[PDB]
Amino acid sequence: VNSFSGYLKLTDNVYIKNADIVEEAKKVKPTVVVNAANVYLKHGGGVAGALNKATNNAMQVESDDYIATNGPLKVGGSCVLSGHNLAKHCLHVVGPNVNKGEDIQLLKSAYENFNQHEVLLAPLLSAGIFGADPIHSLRVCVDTVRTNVYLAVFDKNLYDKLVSSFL
Numbered sequence: 517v518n519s520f521s522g523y524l525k526l527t528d529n530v531y532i533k534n535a536d537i538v539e540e541a542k543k544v545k546p547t548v549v550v551n552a553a554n555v556y557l558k559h560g561g562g563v564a565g566a567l568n569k570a571t572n573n574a575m576q577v578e579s580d581d582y583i584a585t586n587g588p589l590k591v592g593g594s595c596v597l598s599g600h601n602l603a604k605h606c607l608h609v610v611g612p613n614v615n616k617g618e619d620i621q622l623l624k625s626a627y628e629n630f631n632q633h634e635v636l637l638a639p640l641l642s643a644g645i646f647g648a649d650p651i652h653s654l655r656v657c658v659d660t661v662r663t664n665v666y667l668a669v670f671d672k673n674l675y676d677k678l679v680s681s682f683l
């Protein structure tokens with residue numbers, strides 16, 4: 517049993533809810549929250565900007581030190597950093613950004629990072645301002661992630677469309 521409440525079960529291991537991931541992280545304090553990161557860990561907008569704002573910019577300060585030491589992530593890659601006041605850990609995952617021309621096939625590689633963690637609170641990778649079709653992102657998630665994933669979809673309209681269209 518875990519602390520996640522009000523989710524809709526899609527599969528054996530994937531659950532979904534209409535929720536602000538920031539508000540959900542603050543309530544649950546999950547072991548892992550996933551950030552919709554870019555390779556530079558520049559948390560300017562969407563999930564990353566909202567998560568970073570909720571940490572009072574401590575996520576960005578930590579991220580800048582990580583990049584100064586290690587250089588940029590790969591598209592499809594990830595790193596584990598602090599979850600600050602939101603979670604134990606933040607798994608920063610880089611899905612491909614369609615608005616930068618990145619290979620959508622990298623979305624499966626991005627989701628494979630989730631399999632290193634038994635339970636996660638996450639957004640749909642490459643959705644929102646990353647430009648991918650969220651229906652596609654949910655299908656790749658279900659077909660890739662084997663660990664237990666609790667998806668927080670920000671848009672009520674989109675949430676209802678994801679549920680209604682789910683095969």
Ligand SMILES: O=C(O)c1cncc(O)c1
Pocket residue numbers: 561562563639640643644645646668669670671
């Ligand atoms: O994860 C989301 O629900 C999301 C919704 N809108 C914009 C965005 O970048 C992400």
